[PDB]
Structures are given as C-alpha cells and as structure tokens.
Amino acid sequence: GEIAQALKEIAKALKECAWALKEIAQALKG
C-alpha cells in the first residue's frame, strides 16, 4: 500500500547510496 511501498522505496534508495559510499571508501583504502 501507498505508505509501506514509499518506505520500501526510501530503503532501496538508501541501499544504493550505501553501495556507492562503500565504493568511494574502497577506492581510497581497499
């Protein structure tokens, strides 16, 4: 439903942010 799906979309966008931030960290110290 509208609210459950909105929170899922927020979680998914934050997982994409987390992946990219780990890629940036890994470029500096991996």
Residue numbers at the binding site for a second copy (CB under 8 A):
1-4, 6-30
Rounded to a whole number of angstroms, the minimum distance from the CB of residue 6 to a second copy is 3
Rounded to a whole number of angstroms, the minimum distance from the CB of residue 18 to a second copy is 4
Measured CA to CA, the distance from residue 11 to residue 28 in angstroms comes to 26
Buried b (16+ CB within 10 A) or exposed e, 10-29: eeeeeeeeeeeeeeeeeeee
Rounded to a whole number of angstroms, the minimum distance from the CB of residue 22 to a second copy is 5
